[PDB]
C-alpha cells in the first residue's frame, strides 16, 4: 500500500498489509506465476546455481528472485491462506536457503509462532532430506534455521517435538556430534571431539580452545559458535515431558559433567 520514494527492500510499514490485496494475489494466479518464474531459470540453464553461474556478472539476473521472495514473503503477513498456499509450494524453496537468492528470511515467517499448518505441513521425509549435505556441511546457521522450526513456538509444540527428536540423534550422523564423554586423563578435564568431516576425528582438547578465545585458526573460531549453536539446540529440543529424548541425553552429560562446565574457566 506503499508509494515510491526509494529503496524497494525496505519493509518498514507492517501496519496493515491490504487483506484484500493479498487476497488478490493469491486467487488471481499471481503467487502461482511468481513458483514457475523461480524454477524457469534452472531448468533453462539445466536442460548453475552458484557452484557453476554464482558469477558477478549474473548481478541483475539475480535482482528479480531476490524480489520475487520479497514479494512472497510480503503475501502471507497475519494470512493464514497464503502462509498456506505457500507452505504447500515448500519441497522446492527448501533447496535454497543457504544461497543469495533472499529465501533465508521468507522461510522463517512461515514458522513463526504458528500451529496447525505447521504440525502438518512438515513431515518426517522433509527432515530427512533436511538432513543432507547441509548438515553434513559447515555454517551453522542452517542448524538453528532447524532450531526454530524444531519447537521454538510459543511453548512447547506436542506434534513435531517428537518428530525432530528421532532425527537428529537417531541415528548419529550428519556432523556427528562434539562428543563430551569425561575422558578421565590428564581435576580429569573434558575432552570434546571435532572433526574436519574428512578422515578420522582428530580433536585437540578443549583447554587448546581456551587461549583461542582472543586469536586463532578459523577452524578453532568457528567450533565453539558450532557447539553454543547445537547445545542451544538440545536446550531448546526438550523442553517439557518428553520420553523420547530424555534418557539418551541424561547419561550422556550427566549431573556430574553438566555441574563441572558450572566452573570460573575462560569460555
Same mark, same amino acid.
Given at each position: 500500500?506503499?508509494?515510491?520514494?526509494?529503496?524497494?527492500?525496505?519493509?518498514?510499514?507492517?501496519?496493515?498489509?491490504?487483506?484484500?490485496?493479498?487476497?488478490?494475489?493469491?486467487?488471481?494466479?499471481?503467487? +502461482? =506465476? *511468481?513458483?514457475?518464474?523461480?524454477? /524457469?531459470?534452472? %531448468?533453462?540453464?539445466?536442460? !548453475?546455481?552458484?557452484?557453476?553461474?554464482?558469477?558477478?556478472?549474473?548481478?541483475?539476473?539475480?535482482?528479480?528472485?531476490?524480489?520475487?521472495?520479497?514479494?512472497?514473503?510480503?503475501?502471507?503477513?497475519?494470512?493464514?491462506?497464503?502462509?498456506?498456499?505457500?507452505?504447500?509450494?515448500f519441497g522446492?524453496?527448501q +533447496? =535454497? *536457503?543457504?544461497?543469495?537468492?533472499? /529465501?533465508?528470511? %521468507?522461510?522463517?515467517?512461515? !514458522?513463526?509462532?504458528?500451529?496447525?499448518?505447521?504440525?502438518?505441513?512438515i513431515t518426517a521425509a522433509e527432515i530427512d532430506t533436511f538432513?543432507?549435505?547441509?548438515?553434513?556441511?559447515?555454517?551453522?546457521?542452517?542448524?538453528?534455521?532447524?532450531?526454530?522450526?524444531?519447537?521454538?513456538?510459543?511453548?512447547?509444540?506436542?506434534?513435531?517435538?517428537?518428530?525432530?527428536?528421532?532425527?537428529?540423534?537417531?541415528?548419529?550422523?550428519?556432523?556427528?556430534?562434539?562428543?563430551?564423554?569425561?575422558?578421565?586423563?590428564?581435576?580429569?578435564?573434558?575432552?570434546?571431539?571435532?572433526?574436519?568431516?574428512?578422515?578420522?576425528?582428530?580433536?585437540?582438547?578443549?583447554?587448546?580452545?581456551?587461549?583461542?578465545?582472543?586469536?586463532?585458526?578459523?577452524?578453532?573460531?568457528?567450533?565453539?559458535?558450532?557447539?553454543?549453536?547445537?547445545?542451544?539446540?538440545?536446550?531448546?529440543?526438550?523442553?517439557?515431558?518428553?520420553?523420547?529424548?530424555?534418557?539418551?541425553?541424561?547419561?550422556?552429560?550427566?549431573?556430574?559433567?553438566?555441574?563441572?562446565?558450572?566452573?570460573?574457566?575462560?569460555?
Open positions: 500500500g506503499g508509494t515510491n520514494s526509494g529503496q524497494d527492500v525496505l519493509e518498514v510499514v507492517f501496519s496493515k498489509p491490504n487483506r484484500e490485496r493479498q487476497k488478490l494475489m493469491r486467487e488471481q494466479n499471481i503467487l +502461482k =506465476q *511468481i513458483f514457475k518464474l523461480l524454477q /524457469a531459470p534452472f %531448468t533453462d540453464c539445466g536442460d !548453475l546455481r552458484l557452484e557453476e553461474l554464482g558469477d558477478q556478472r549474473h548481478a541483475p539476473f539475480r535482482h528479480i528472485c531476490r524480489l520475487c521472495y520479497r514479494v512472497l514473503r510480503h503475501s502471507q503477513q497475519d494470512y493464514r491462506k497464503n502462509q498456506e498456499y505457500i507452505a504447500k509450494q522446492f524453496m +533447496k =535454497q *536457503i543457504g544461497y543469495d537468492v533472499l /529465501a533465508e528470511d %521468507t522461510i522463517t515467517a512461515l !514458522l513463526h509462532n504458528n500451529r496447525k499448518l505447521l504440525e502438518k505441513h538432513v543432507s549435505l547441509v548438515r553434513k556441511n559447515r555454517e551453522p546457521r542452517f542448524l538453528d534455521y532447524l532450531s526454530d522450526l524444531c519447537v521454538s513456538m510459543n511453548k512447547s509444540i506436542p506434534v513435531t517435538q517428537e518428530l525432530i527428536c528421532k532425527a537428529v540423534l537417531n541415528p548419529t550422523n550428519a556432523d556427528i556430534l562434539i562428543e563430551t564423554k569425561l575422558v578421565l586423563s590428564r581435576e580429569e578435564e573434558v575432552w570434546l571431539f571435532w572433526r574436519d568431516s574428512n578422515k578420522e576425528i582428530r580433536s585437540k582438547s578443549v583447554r587448546e580452545l581456551a587461549q583461542d578465545a582472543k586469536e586463532g585458526q578459523k577452524e578453532d573460531r568457528d567450533v565453539l559458535s558450532y557447539y553454543r549453536y547445537q547445545l542451544n539446540l538440545f536446550a531448546r529440543m526438550c523442553l517439557d515431558r518428553q520420553y523420547l529424548a530424555i534418557n539418551e541425553i541424561s547419561g550422556q552429560l550427566d549431573v556430574d559433567l553438566i555441574l563441572r562446565c558450572m566452573s570460573d574457566e575462560n569460555l
